PDB file of all heavy atoms in Angstrom:
ATOM      1  N   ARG B 191      -0.842  11.386 -22.168  1.00 84.56           N
ATOM      2  CA  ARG B 191      -0.978   9.876 -22.521  1.00 84.56           C
ATOM      3  C   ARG B 191      -2.240   9.751 -23.431  1.00 84.56           C
ATOM      4  O   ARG B 191      -3.127  10.568 -23.342  1.00 84.56           O
ATOM      5  CB  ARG B 191      -1.251   9.167 -21.069  1.00 84.56           C
ATOM      6  CG  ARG B 191      -0.215   9.313 -20.133  1.00 84.56           C
ATOM      7  CD  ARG B 191       0.972   8.376 -20.611  1.00 84.56           C
ATOM      8  NE  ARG B 191       1.901   8.155 -19.534  1.00 84.56           N
ATOM      9  CZ  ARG B 191       2.881   7.384 -19.541  1.00 84.56           C
ATOM     10  NH1 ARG B 191       3.171   6.636 -20.709  1.00 84.56           N
ATOM     11  NH2 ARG B 191       3.738   7.221 -18.531  1.00 84.56           N
ATOM     12  N   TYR B 192      -2.211   8.726 -24.182  1.00 82.82           N
ATOM     13  CA  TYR B 192      -3.413   8.416 -25.133  1.00 82.82           C
ATOM     14  C   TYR B 192      -4.507   7.691 -24.361  1.00 82.82           C
ATOM     15  O   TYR B 192      -4.262   6.646 -23.783  1.00 82.82           O
ATOM     16  CB  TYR B 192      -2.908   7.657 -26.275  1.00 82.82           C
ATOM     17  CG  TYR B 192      -1.886   8.490 -27.185  1.00 82.82           C
ATOM     18  CD1 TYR B 192      -0.614   8.148 -27.298  1.00 82.82           C
ATOM     19  CD2 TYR B 192      -2.327   9.614 -27.873  1.00 82.82           C
ATOM     20  CE1 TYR B 192       0.308   8.933 -28.076  1.00 82.82           C
ATOM     21  CE2 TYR B 192      -1.534  10.419 -28.711  1.00 82.82           C
ATOM     22  CZ  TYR B 192      -0.161  10.059 -28.765  1.00 82.82           C
ATOM     23  OH  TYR B 192       0.735  10.840 -29.469  1.00 82.82           O
ATOM     24  N   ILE B 193      -5.635   8.157 -24.335  1.00 79.44           N
ATOM     25  CA  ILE B 193      -6.778   7.601 -23.763  1.00 79.44           C
ATOM     26  C   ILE B 193      -7.205   6.298 -24.346  1.00 79.44           C
ATOM     27  O   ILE B 193      -7.684   5.297 -23.628  1.00 79.44           O
ATOM     28  CB  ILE B 193      -8.071   8.438 -23.765  1.00 79.44           C
ATOM     29  CG1 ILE B 193      -7.668   9.894 -23.631  1.00 79.44           C
ATOM     30  CG2 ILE B 193      -8.932   7.992 -22.693  1.00 79.44           C
ATOM     31  CD1 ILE B 193      -6.847  10.257 -22.506  1.00 79.44           C
ATOM     32  N   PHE B 194      -6.926   6.121 -25.597  1.00 78.82           N
ATOM     33  CA  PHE B 194      -7.259   4.959 -26.307  1.00 78.82           C
ATOM     34  C   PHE B 194      -6.049   3.991 -26.506  1.00 78.82           C
ATOM     35  O   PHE B 194      -6.325   2.701 -26.443  1.00 78.82           O
ATOM     36  CB  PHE B 194      -8.039   5.214 -27.505  1.00 78.82           C
ATOM     37  CG  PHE B 194      -9.376   5.742 -27.475  1.00 78.82           C
ATOM     38  CD1 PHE B 194      -9.512   7.163 -27.289  1.00 78.82           C
ATOM     39  CD2 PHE B 194     -10.555   4.908 -27.555  1.00 78.82           C
ATOM     40  CE1 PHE B 194     -10.821   7.668 -27.132  1.00 78.82           C
ATOM     41  CE2 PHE B 194     -11.664   5.557 -27.552  1.00 78.82           C
ATOM     42  CZ  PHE B 194     -11.860   6.926 -27.334  1.00 78.82           C
ATOM     43  N   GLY B 195      -4.919   4.478 -26.931  1.00 78.87           N
ATOM     44  CA  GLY B 195      -3.871   3.563 -27.161  1.00 78.87           C
ATOM     45  C   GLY B 195      -2.417   4.185 -27.133  1.00 78.87           C
ATOM     46  O   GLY B 195      -2.099   5.035 -28.027  1.00 78.87           O
ATOM     47  N   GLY B 196      -1.474   3.679 -26.318  1.00 79.42           N
ATOM     48  CA  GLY B 196      -0.170   4.159 -26.190  1.00 79.42           C
ATOM     49  C   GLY B 196       0.357   3.980 -27.652  1.00 79.42           C
ATOM     50  O   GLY B 196       0.140   2.819 -28.110  1.00 79.42           O
ATOM     51  N   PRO B 197       1.135   4.780 -28.282  1.00 78.47           N
ATOM     52  CA  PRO B 197       1.861   4.745 -29.476  1.00 78.47           C
ATOM     53  C   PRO B 197       1.964   3.366 -30.232  1.00 78.47           C
ATOM     54  O   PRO B 197       2.041   3.320 -31.487  1.00 78.47           O
ATOM     55  CB  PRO B 197       3.203   5.385 -29.277  1.00 78.47           C
ATOM     56  CG  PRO B 197       2.783   6.467 -28.328  1.00 78.47           C
ATOM     57  CD  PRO B 197       1.854   5.725 -27.277  1.00 78.47           C
ATOM     58  N   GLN B 198       2.025   2.321 -29.429  1.00 80.45           N
ATOM     59  CA  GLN B 198       2.245   0.876 -30.024  1.00 80.45           C
ATOM     60  C   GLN B 198       1.262   0.677 -31.156  1.00 80.45           C
ATOM     61  O   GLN B 198       1.744   0.151 -32.238  1.00 80.45           O
ATOM     62  CB  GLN B 198       2.034  -0.089 -28.935  1.00 80.45           C
ATOM     63  CG  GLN B 198       3.349  -0.610 -28.280  1.00 80.45           C
ATOM     64  CD  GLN B 198       4.165   0.559 -27.688  1.00 80.45           C
ATOM     65  OE1 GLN B 198       3.648   1.315 -26.934  1.00 80.45           O
ATOM     66  NE2 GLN B 198       5.458   0.531 -28.068  1.00 80.45           N
ATOM     67  N   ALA B 199       0.087   0.837 -30.945  1.00 81.75           N
ATOM     68  CA  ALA B 199      -1.011   0.621 -32.057  1.00 81.75           C
ATOM     69  C   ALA B 199      -2.298   1.333 -31.754  1.00 81.75           C
ATOM     70  O   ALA B 199      -2.703   1.458 -30.658  1.00 81.75           O
ATOM     71  CB  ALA B 199      -1.266  -0.888 -32.163  1.00 81.75           C
ATOM     72  N   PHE B 200      -3.002   1.683 -32.893  1.00 80.08           N
ATOM     73  CA  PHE B 200      -4.195   2.391 -32.762  1.00 80.08           C
ATOM     74  C   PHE B 200      -5.209   1.487 -32.108  1.00 80.08           C
ATOM     75  O   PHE B 200      -5.153   0.335 -32.237  1.00 80.08           O
ATOM     76  CB  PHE B 200      -4.939   2.785 -34.075  1.00 80.08           C
ATOM     77  CG  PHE B 200      -4.197   3.865 -34.738  1.00 80.08           C
ATOM     78  CD1 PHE B 200      -2.945   3.580 -35.461  1.00 80.08           C
ATOM     79  CD2 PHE B 200      -4.775   5.058 -34.868  1.00 80.08           C
ATOM     80  CE1 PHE B 200      -2.328   4.642 -36.032  1.00 80.08           C
ATOM     81  CE2 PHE B 200      -4.238   6.145 -35.600  1.00 80.08           C
ATOM     82  CZ  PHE B 200      -2.966   5.892 -36.134  1.00 80.08           C
ATOM     83  N   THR B 201      -6.148   2.086 -31.232  1.00 79.98           N
ATOM     84  CA  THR B 201      -7.067   1.230 -30.596  1.00 79.98           C
ATOM     85  C   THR B 201      -8.058   0.783 -31.577  1.00 79.98           C
ATOM     86  O   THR B 201      -8.078   1.227 -32.640  1.00 79.98           O
ATOM     87  CB  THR B 201      -7.921   2.052 -29.515  1.00 79.98           C
ATOM     88  OG1 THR B 201      -8.942   1.156 -28.936  1.00 79.98           O
ATOM     89  CG2 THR B 201      -8.535   3.189 -30.216  1.00 79.98           C
ATOM     90  N   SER B 202      -8.758  -0.464 -31.323  1.00 79.48           N
ATOM     91  CA  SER B 202      -9.759  -0.963 -32.304  1.00 79.48           C
ATOM     92  C   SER B 202     -10.813   0.072 -32.579  1.00 79.48           C
ATOM     93  O   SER B 202     -10.922   1.110 -31.843  1.00 79.48           O
ATOM     94  CB  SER B 202     -10.273  -2.230 -31.481  1.00 79.48           C
ATOM     95  OG  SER B 202     -10.521  -1.972 -30.111  1.00 79.48           O
TER      96      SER B 202
END
Side-chain angles (χ1 to χ4, degrees):
Chain B
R191 298 288 196 171
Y192 295 110
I193 324 309
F194 291 84
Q198 266 57 51
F200 286 74
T201 175
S202 40

